[PDB]
Design an enzyme around this catalytic site. Structure first.
Site, short mmCIF file in Angstrom:
data_model
loop_
_atom_site.label_atom_id
_atom_site.label_comp_id
_atom_site.label_asym_id
_atom_site.label_seq_id
_atom_site.Cartn_x
_atom_site.Cartn_y
_atom_site.Cartn_z
N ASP A 76 0.91 -1.25 0.23
CA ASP A 76 0.03 -0.12 0.08
C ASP A 76 0.79 1.24 0.06
OD1 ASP A 76 -1.66 2.23 0.72
OD2 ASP A 76 -3.00 0.95 1.84
N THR A 77 0.90 1.96 -1.11
CA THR A 77 1.82 3.28 -1.04
C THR A 77 1.16 4.32 -0.47
OG1 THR A 77 0.87 3.60 -3.44
CG2 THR A 77 2.75 2.15 -3.20
N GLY A 78 -0.24 4.30 -0.16
CA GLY A 78 -0.72 5.35 0.60
C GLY A 78 -0.44 5.24 2.18
O1 LIG Z 1 -7.64 4.25 5.69
C1 LIG Z 1 -6.89 4.14 4.75
N1 LIG Z 1 -7.65 3.17 3.70
C2 LIG Z 1 -8.92 3.11 3.52
C3 LIG Z 1 -9.65 3.07 2.41
C4 LIG Z 1 -10.68 2.33 2.32
C5 LIG Z 1 -11.09 2.53 0.83
C6 LIG Z 1 -11.15 3.29 0.05
C7 LIG Z 1 -11.71 3.46 -1.36
O2 LIG Z 1 -11.39 2.21 -2.12
C8 LIG Z 1 -9.93 4.31 0.15
C9 LIG Z 1 -9.24 4.49 1.48
C10 LIG Z 1 -6.82 1.96 3.07
C11 LIG Z 1 -6.10 1.23 4.18
C12 LIG Z 1 -7.22 0.42 5.18
C13 LIG Z 1 -8.01 -0.82 4.20
C14 LIG Z 1 -8.88 -1.23 5.20
C15 LIG Z 1 -9.23 -0.96 6.38
C16 LIG Z 1 -8.63 -0.02 7.11
C17 LIG Z 1 -7.37 0.50 6.32
C18 LIG Z 1 -5.78 2.46 2.04
O3 LIG Z 1 -5.39 1.36 1.52
C19 LIG Z 1 -4.52 3.42 2.88
O4 LIG Z 1 -3.55 3.51 1.88
C20 LIG Z 1 -4.85 4.46 3.73
C21 LIG Z 1 -5.48 5.54 2.65
C22 LIG Z 1 -5.36 6.84 3.43
C23 LIG Z 1 -4.12 7.70 3.69
C24 LIG Z 1 -4.22 8.95 4.19
C25 LIG Z 1 -5.47 9.43 4.77
C26 LIG Z 1 -6.46 8.48 4.78
C27 LIG Z 1 -6.48 7.51 4.20
N2 LIG Z 1 -5.74 4.37 4.80
C28 LIG Z 1 -5.16 4.95 6.05
C29 LIG Z 1 -3.79 4.41 6.38
C30 LIG Z 1 -2.75 5.56 6.78
C31 LIG Z 1 -1.67 5.35 7.63
C32 LIG Z 1 -1.35 4.03 7.82
C33 LIG Z 1 -0.12 3.65 8.59
O5 LIG Z 1 0.94 4.76 8.33
C34 LIG Z 1 -2.17 2.98 7.07
C35 LIG Z 1 -3.48 3.33 6.63
#
Ligand SMILES: O=C1N(Cc2ccc(CO)cc2)[C@H](Cc2ccccc2)[C@H](O)[C@@H](O)[C@@H](Cc2ccccc2)N1Cc1ccc(CO)cc1
EC number: 3.4.23.16
Lengths: 99, 99
Positions: A25-27
């Site tokens: 996950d690059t996000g």
């Molecule tokens: O909530 C996150 N979604 C949620 C999400 C769900 C659905 C969609 C549309 O399809 C988009 C985003 C994913 C990870 C996730 C999957 C399922 C349950 C819980 C986690 C994503 O895959 C991740 O990239 C980041 C995206 C993100 C980035 C910045 C701000 C908000 C959201 N996140 C959050 C995240 C941030 C930090 C860390 C560790 O540093 C890990 C995860």
């Protein structure tokens, strides 16, 4: 390898001797894994996502194999449907995005 | 280009005539954009991540220019704290993970 994104980018990881499935996950900034036992002390950590902030457990210098490549670094433990390999470890195994 | 992951992979996009910053995320299925207006019909959807679920509007067939690469597909609009460019549009621009 080269990994296209038509499907979820799911790989096998090995940690505390166990094989698990995980998402590249690059996000995300720091790797997050589903509840398990890890050695040593942990520290509190706040992480923000789509719905808001949550508290998780931070463990340092944890040894992990990702798709057969060796990494050692921070793993966070908290509530997720899946193990998320984030930028901190993706950089250690030399992953980059290309387009 | 080739995007390393030492830092958040932030890119400039254009959607509905507006320029914005967005995160390239191989971990998300569907693209999510902060509240804005878009033309056309839409249907309600709930998406969930770290921290909980949020209500979004789902718009289909929306065009997005991503770092100069045009792409089309579904866009979810809602109170996300970051704009996220997900796999449904990353595939269209040919993006891959490589290591
Ligand atoms: O909530 C996150 N979604 C949620 C999400 C769900 C659905 C969609 C549309 O399809 C988009 C985003 C994913 C990870 C996730 C999957 C399922 C349950 C819980 C986690 C994503 O895959 C991740 O990239 C980041 C995206 C993100 C980035 C910045 C701000 C908000 C959201 N996140 C959050 C995240 C941030 C930090 C860390 C560790 O540093 C890990 C995860």
């Amino acid at each position: 390898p080269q990994i296209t994104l038509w499907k979820r980018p799911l790989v096998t990881i090995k940690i505390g001797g166990q094989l698990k499935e995980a998402l590249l996950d690059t996000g995300a900034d720091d790797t997050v894994i589903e509840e398990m036992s890890l050695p040593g002390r942990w520290k509190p950590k706040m992480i923000g996502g789509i719905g808001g902030f949550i508290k998780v457990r931070q463990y340092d210098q944890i040894i992990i194999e990702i798709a057969g490549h060796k990494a050692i670094g921070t793993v966070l433990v908290g509530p997720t449907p899946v193990n998320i390999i984030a930028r901190n470890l993706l950089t250690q195994i030399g992953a980059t995005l290309n387009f």
